[PDB]
Amino acid sequence: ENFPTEYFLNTTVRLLEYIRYRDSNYTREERIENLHYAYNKAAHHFAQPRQQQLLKVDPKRLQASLQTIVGMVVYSWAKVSKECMADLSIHYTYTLVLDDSKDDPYPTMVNYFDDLQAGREQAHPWWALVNEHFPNVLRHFGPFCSLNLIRSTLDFFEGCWIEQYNFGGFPGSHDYPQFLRRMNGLGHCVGASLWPKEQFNERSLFLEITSAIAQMENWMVWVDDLMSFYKEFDDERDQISLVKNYVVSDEISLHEALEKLTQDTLHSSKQMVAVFSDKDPQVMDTIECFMHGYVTWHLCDRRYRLSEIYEKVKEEKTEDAQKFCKFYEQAANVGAVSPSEWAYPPVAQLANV
Amino acid sequence: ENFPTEYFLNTTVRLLEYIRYRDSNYTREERIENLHYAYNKAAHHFAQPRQQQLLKVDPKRLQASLQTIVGMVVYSWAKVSKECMADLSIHYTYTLVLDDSKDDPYPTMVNYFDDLQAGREQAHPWWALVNEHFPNVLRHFGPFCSLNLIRSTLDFFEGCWIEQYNFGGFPGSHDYPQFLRRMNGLGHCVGASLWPKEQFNERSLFLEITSAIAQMENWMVWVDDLMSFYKEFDDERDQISLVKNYVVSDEISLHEALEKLTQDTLHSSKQMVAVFSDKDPQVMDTIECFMHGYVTWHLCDRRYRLSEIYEKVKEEKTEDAQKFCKFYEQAANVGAVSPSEWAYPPVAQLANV
Ligand SMILES: [Mg+2]
Ligand SMILES: [Mg+2]
Ligand SMILES: [Mg+2]
Known part of the structure; x- marks a missing residue:
């Protein structure tokens, strides 16, 4: 009934310690420069007439979606170039936006392969x-990383199709929940997009990159699920999250579902560190900056409403509460930025022009 | 090292006993009819000069691969049409050929997306x-099942690419083993190819089909991991396998890996029943025919050399050796068909003509 505040607090602090969440050389001024650069290129892109006409999305939702995505990319893909941040921001905004469509894909997919093979739109x-x-x-x-982005985006399209059915799985269908989360998670897209050929040699680092994809796919989706648990707790509109599907498909209590998610998240966090700590420094740096940035993004984006938690335990003398607050303040310290500092002008304004 | 023959018998028996292996998908005459029909069309296809030119494979390997796949399809896709069996036999023969192949995709995948988008070969x-x-x-x-076949074949391609490196994962990379197995398992291709639109309405059974894909993906791959353990054990090309990757990645004994696998496999089997038992009978039928036929195929087909094991424990007085031999005999009774009764003429002969 009530939100598991202490249990949630404990898990979150554990997660941040396990990933060695700490300060970086990535400054606020650098952040702002990157945020504005990625936002500006993406904004001009979505403002073009063709995009404006084929992408069915409410203007205000598109604006909000683009801003959250730019934040996610600039903060998590800390090492890539500005151009790369901008181009990835566009791609992930396209994926987030497809979730606003309730239109049945069936009719538009009947000739998918033939049109693809023939090169027809x-x-x-x-x-x-x-x-x-x-x-x-x-x-x-490079080609290997590209193949991964292509596949993950294709999987995502199928995941959105499946979700239009608002199906959490048949009771007893234990393999359904993760099948769906992987399908909609963009894990291999995220995992492989962390290695621009400009900074990494795909062939020389094939093993570390392939391993990063395998481990980051689960880490990323589970951390998103865990950090989204608070905002989704009472959301009666959101009916088929991973945790909610665990309940339906595995026939277990929400608490047990949360426990499952917590165990997987913490273990994933530890093996991430364990495996890459001794590997190539540049690779470990990318992985570590993704984890930290990804967490900071969740802590700073209003969408996750975690500020509500910080505001509820801000004065408790509990260990976890105090640790959560310190981490939260650390995050806001470098992540709490005003949109007026980078997200301008609005997409709709550029569209009218 | 030495093949865990003793344990191989223990696990195999447990699986067969639990699923209650019993193949009754065909009369001997029907089985021969389908095998020949599928083989004949596939044989003429692979004998075309274009196919002979581009598909780089030793004639004897192609021939052996085609017969192995015609058997797989006919034996497990018992409810689809002869034409579907034939066309599916061609597709899966292309994949098996790549499955044992050793090539570097890299140079020919550099312009993959651009050529795909432009419609260039x-x-x-x-x-x-x-x-x-x-x-x-x-x-x-229909479009949904088609999308699944396309994704799974693309995943499969990436899977064979990764295997080219003979990497079993970094010790501690717990997510790698299954990451790779799903990548190379062709799970969604197989699971979705069980529902031809001629017999099933993709929209009326969307949920059961999606569920079947999700659950069969793991049953299918795990059952093959267990049963094909023998032929892969000492094969250089197969040293990178789920079982052997569990050892390396999770740092556990071959014994523990097998037990882990059989436990998953038994659980997967249990949920397949629990979920589809009381669902649409036509769906349950296709599922049952696949599971049993799939096992029959593994016990009879050459590729898995399970006869070799039979010719060694047939005399042994162990309880597992007796259970295994009873099953092997039961499978041969229906599945042991002479190639001379359907696999003719040889692809090579049709090619030269
Ligand atoms: Mg394989
Ligand atoms: Mg193989
Ligand atoms: Mg195998």
Whole structure:
């Protein structure tokens, strides 16, 4: 009934300690420069007439979606170039936006393969925009990493299709929940997009990169699920989250579902550190900066409402409460930025022009 | 080292006993009918000069691979049409060929996306043949199932790429083993290819089909990991396997890995029943025919050399050796068919003509 505040607090602090969440050389001024650069290129992109006409999305939602994504990319893909941040920001905004569509994909997918093989534009307008823009993203990567982004985005499309059914799985279908989360998680897209060929040699680091994808896929989706647990707790609109599907498919209490998620998240966090600590320094740096930035993004983006938790235990003398607050303040310290400092002008204004 | 023959018998018996292995998908006459029909069409396809030119494989290997796959398809896709069996046999023969192949995809995947988007033939000859043939397979399915086949085949390609490095994962990279197995397992391709639109309405059974894909993906791969353990054990190309990757990645004994696998496999089997038992009978039927036929195929087909094991423990007085031999005999009774009764003429002969 009530939110598991202490249990949530303990797990979150454990998660941050396990990943060695600490300060970086990534400054606020640098952040702002990156945020504005990525926002500005993406904003001009989505403001073009073709994009404005084929991408069915409410203007205010697009604006909010773009801002949250730019934040996610600039903060988590800390080592990539500005161009790479901008181009990845566009791709991930396309993916987030597809979740606003309730339109049945069936009719637009009947000739998917034949049109693809023939080089004809796809019937589904989202595929038309995404496949047209894709090269701007792939140009930053080698063939192996590119193949991964392509596959993950294709999986994501199928995941959105499945979700239109608002199905959490048949009771007893234990393998359904993760099958769905992987399908919609963009794990291999995220995992592989951390290695621009400009900074990494895909062939020389094949093993570390392949391993990063395998481990980051689960780390990223589970951390998102865990940190989204507070905002989703009482959301009666959101009915098929991973945790909620665990309840339905595994026939267990929400608490047990949360326990499952916590165990997987903490273990994933430890093996991440254990495996990459001794590997190539540049690789460990990218992985570590992703984890930290990804957490900071969740802590600083209003969408997750975690400030509400910080505000509820801000004066408790509990160990976890105090540790959570210190971490939170650390995050806001470098992540709490006013949108007026980078996200301007609005996409709709550039669209009218 | 030495093959855990003793434990191999223990696990195999447990699985067969739990699923209650019993193949009754065909009369001997029907089985021969389908095998020949599928083989004959596939044989004429692979004998075409274009196919002979681009598919780089030793004639004897192609021949042996085709017969192994015709058996897999006919034996497990018992409810689909002869045409579907044939077209699926061609597709899965392309994949098995790549499955044992040793090539570097890298150079021919550099312009993969751009060529795909422009409708230009792919540089990698395998993709050139597979994508050209694909429509003959997809015409049997609705858009959702088709999308699944496409994704799984693309995943499979990446899977074989990774295997080229003979990497079993970094010690402690717990997520690597299954990451790779799903990547190379063709799970969604197999699971989705069980629902031809001629017999099933993709929209009326969307949930059961999605569920079947999710659950069968793991049953399918795990069952093969267990049963194909023998032929892979000492094969250089198969040293990177789920079982052997569990050892390296999770730092555990081959024994523990096998027990882990069989436990998963038994659980997967249990939920398959629990979930589909009381669902649409036509769906349950296709699922049952696949599970039993899939096992029959592993016990009879050459590729898995399970006869060799039979010819060694047949005399042994162990209880497992007796259970295994009873099952092996039961499977041969229905599945042991002479190639001379259906696999003719040889591909090579049709090619020279
Ligand atoms: Mg394989
Ligand atoms: Mg193989
Ligand atoms: Mg195998």
